[PDB]
Design a protein around this ligand. Structure first.
Ligand SMILES: *[C@@H]1O[C@H](CO)[C@@H](O[C@@H]2O[C@H](CO)[C@@H](O)[C@H](O)[C@H]2NC(C)=O)[C@H](O)[C@H]1NC(C)=O
Lengths: 237, 194, 180, 200
């Protein structure tokens, strides 16, 4: 498939950013699209044999290139808040176009809006265990910005998918604010007898994509770097 | 636009387009990922099918339909129709606005209930879990901006072959409790509060 | 091939000298439009076409880029031979029977053009004339050479003689074709 | 309704890399639609050409790309192995040739420009038949009511390049009075044939 990097980017207003795309092998057309909730999918430009062949309606601070092997880069200079979007690369040989996974760019007002999640796990209700013979753990990841997280559940050291529901979109903690921090919930449901065994270990884990160990930081709190935050519980009788 | 249906029912989506074309293709997207192509139909064809999909094309009205048979939870996605706008090559396609399709589970034995959790020592938060309701129940937001409530979500216990809907609410208010948490939503009258 | 009608949708040309390209559609041997590739616009050849028809000039730009790529690929797998220069064949005639005092159009047909690099100009009593001059695009032929036609609108005559002047690499010197 | 076009297939190399003296390397792509009896019979031939050498073609009566010279096999093999490309091109007869014929039917195929016909002495009678479209025409000379079989020379049909044609038809005659010579011109635009008479 097509591959794109980096996957997650944080920038401030006035900076620039570069995204790379490797098309499917033998595909010579590489195009770039910008996806935003306000405007949907908008075409930026298409490259073919090294040169820009078609262009959409974005201003000249959005630019691109293509190498002899067909790989493409795009560049956005003098970044604005409205540039925050999913940037998609796509390759074609015929009629069907094949998309990469996308690069998520968040342009922030200030690096101080960046925060890692706090993660907490809540143990099953006793009344649920009686009524159903089942137990639901809940994980809450709260206070994070931007929304660049991956949540997973781990049972006795191994990642589980069965019995897991994680909200598809984070909630805003302050719906009015553009800079608003987020929350995300997830559930893991197991049999009550599995939860009742005190040698079973449960961990809710969040990967957060944030700043680099290279970025400057002068706020009175820990630098909000890329990191994993977790919380854990043991079963109990 | 939006479509909600039950696992196992057929889903039908519709788009239109504005220019002459050589072909139309439907794509699907899940949140934060690439579009993936589903099926291509040429302007000299009325119908085309493949696997569980069938696309129809009406060149005079300039519309297309996508039929998904025996829909599964995995079909949940946004669906977009793209045309070539007459280019018939290259990487520029014109994508419509999209239909969000939600495929909801068939809940065999509803046992709707609202439970309070605890963890507890660490957090000032209480959390309430509204669970085991059938797929006709919808969950609404807030009011009270210091109460947070998630939309419903489906979970699958593969190897008990059991599916359940749930939603979570929480707050530190501490005058917040379970009973009252989901007030803003039409919940089954049969709902178990302990 | 025997047919009631033949269309070229389209005639695509790219060459290394310039470089340059040409995109046009033809119907029964006449040119419907060309696309001005640098200005990104479709230029229809009749009023009626201009009023009722529409062609996206980006189509032409998409294709021509493909020909430029294809030319590289063919040169890569072959012994890269340049075009042979043909001797072009020139005729000058009028649009209608010429009467002195009555406006008309001289037509210069330059046929068997290959490669499609040519200059066609007009002379009146031996000097250059540019008012009233226009020309077609390169028109395709089924042996894959081209023809091209230049027009000079004029008011004949009394004492005015005209030449069509053609420069091509297949000729040793400019060829002056005198009108009747 | 917009006009459509035939796509030039992309050659599969290479990279490769890429391409002062009067020499020129020329490439042509011709997307050709041949129609007979309305659209009861339609044929598509696409032609890929290096300098003057047609090296590969798609003919809708064959239905696959075909190498025409030893420069072609790599191209034709590649195009035919790409299912989407080959399907695209098999559909072009409908999606492009027929599409665009409907637009011709409203414009070009309705164009009916009547000939101007004049007779002038010569430098012998010349019947000039000018500025007509389409190409089908029949010009005859008559002496009183008899079609002249003999002493008639005609130009070929002359394409002016501006969507009109002309033709000149000359008669060698020995006039005796009171012979009337007439030029008769038939063309699909005419409600009646044009008859021009010469005097004396
Ligand atoms: C077409 O005419 C141009 C302009 O006259 C020719 O290019 C010139 O060629 C003469 C060669 O005698 C030079 O002295 C000039 O330097 C050229 N000017 C430019 C802009 O190129 C060209 O050779 C002619 N083409 C052909 C096919 O004969």
């Amino acid at each position: 498939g097509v591959t794109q990097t980096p996957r997650y980017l944080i920038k401030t207003r006035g900076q620039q950013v570069t995204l790379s795309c490797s098309p499917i092998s033998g595909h010579r057309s590489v195009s770039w699209y910008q996806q935003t909730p306000g405007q949907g999918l908008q075409f930026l430009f298409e490259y073919f044999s090294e040169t820009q062949r078609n262009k959409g309606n974005f201003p000249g601070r959005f630019s691109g290139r293509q190498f002899s092997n067909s790989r493409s880069e795009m560049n956005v200079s003098t970044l604005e808040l409205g540039d925050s979007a999913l940037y998609l690369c796509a390759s074609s040989a015929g009629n069907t176009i094949y998309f990469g996974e996308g690069s998520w760019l968040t342009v922030v007002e200030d690096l101080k809006n960046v925060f890692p999640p706090e993660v907490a796990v809540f143990e099953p209700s006793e009344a649920e265990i009686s009524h159903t013979q089942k137990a639901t753990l809940v994980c809450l990841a709260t206070g994070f910005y931007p929304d660049h997280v991956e949540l997973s559940w781990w049972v006795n050291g191994k990642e589980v998918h069965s019995g897991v529901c994680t909200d598809p979109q984070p909630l805003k903690e302050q719906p009015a604010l553009n800079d608003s921090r987020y929350c995300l919930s997830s559930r893991l449901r197991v049999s009550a007898t599995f939860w009742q065994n005190p040698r079973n270990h449960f961990r809710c884990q969040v990967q957060f994509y944030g700043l680099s160990e290279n970025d400057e930081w002068t706020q009175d709190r820990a630098k909000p770097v890329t990191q994993i935050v977790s919380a854990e519980a043991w079963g109990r009788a | 636009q939006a479509l909600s249906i039950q696992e196992g029912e057929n889903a039908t989506m519709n788009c239109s387009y504005k220019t002459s074309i050589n072909n139309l293709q439907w794509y699907r997207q899940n949140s934060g990922r690439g579009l993936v192509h589903l099926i291509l139909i040429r302007s000299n064809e009325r119908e085309k099918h493949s696997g569980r999909l069938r696309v129809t094309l009406d060149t005079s009205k300039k519309s297309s339909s996508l039929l998904i048979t025996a829909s599964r939870a995995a079909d949940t996605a946004s669906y977009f129709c793209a045309t070539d706008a007459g280019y018939n090559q290259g990487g520029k396609l014109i994508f419509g606005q999209g239909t969000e399709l939600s495929v909801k589970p068939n809940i065999q034995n509803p046992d709707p209930a609202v439970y309070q959790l605890r963890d507890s020592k660490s957090s000032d938060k209480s959390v309430c879990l509204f669970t085991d309701f059938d797929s006709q129940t919808n969950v609404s937001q807030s009011k009270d901006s210091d109460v947070y409530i998630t939309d419903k979500c489906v979970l699958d216990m593969r190897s008990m072959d059991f599916k359940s809907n749930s939603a979570v609410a929480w707050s530190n208010k501490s005058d917040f409790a379970c009973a009252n948490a989901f007030n803003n939503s039409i919940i089954p009258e049969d709902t178990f509060f302990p | 091939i025997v047919a009631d009608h033949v269309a070229s949708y389209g005639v695509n040309l790219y060459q290394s000298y310039g470089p340059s390209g040409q995109y046009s559609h033809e119907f029964d041997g006449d040119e419907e439009f060309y696309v001005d590739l640098e200005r990104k616009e479709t230029v229809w050849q009749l009023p009626l076409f201009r009023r009722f028809r529409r062609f996206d000039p980006q189509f032409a730009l998409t294709n021509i880029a493909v020909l430029k790529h294809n030319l590289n690929c063919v040169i890569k797998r072959s012994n890269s031979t340049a075009a042979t220069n043909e001797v072009p064949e020139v005729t000058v005639f009028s649009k209608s029977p010429v009467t002195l005092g009555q406006p008309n159009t001289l037509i210069c047909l330059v046929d068997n053009i290959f490669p499609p690099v040519v200059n066609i100009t007009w002379l009146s009593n031996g000097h250059s004339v540019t008012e009233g001059v226009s020309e077609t695009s390169f028109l395709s032929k089924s042996d894959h050479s081209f023809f091209k036609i230049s027009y000079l609108t004029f008011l004949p005559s009394a004492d005015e003689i005209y030449d069509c002047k053609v420069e091509h690499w297949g000729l040793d010197e400019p060829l002056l074709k005198h009108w009747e | 309704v917009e006009e459509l076009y035939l796509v030039a297939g992309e050659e599969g190399c290479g990279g490769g890399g890429s391409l002062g003296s009067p020499e020129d390397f020329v490439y042509q792509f011709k997307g050709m639609c041949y129609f007979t009896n309305g659209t009861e019979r339609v044929r598509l031939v696409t032609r890929y050409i290096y300098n003057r050498e047609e090296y590969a073609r798609f003919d809708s009566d064959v239905g696959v790309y075909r190498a025409v010279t030893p420069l072609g096999p790599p191209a034709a093999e590649y195009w035919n192995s790409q299912k989407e490309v080959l399907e695209r091109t098999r559909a072009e007869l409908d999606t492009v040739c027929r599409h665009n014929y409907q637009l011709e039917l409203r414009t070009t195929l309705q164009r009916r420009v009547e000939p101007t016909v004049t007779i002038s002495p010569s430098r012998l009678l010349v019947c000039s038949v000018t500025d007509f479209y389409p190409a089908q025409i029949k010009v005859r000379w008559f002496r009183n009511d008899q079609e002249e079989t003999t002493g008639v020379v005609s130009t070929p049909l002359i394409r002016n390049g501006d969507w009109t044609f002309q033709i000149l038809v000359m008669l060698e005659m020995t006039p005796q009075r009171g012979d009337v010579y007439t030029c008769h011109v038939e063309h699909p635009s005419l409600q009646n044939p044009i008859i021009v008479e010469w005097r004396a």
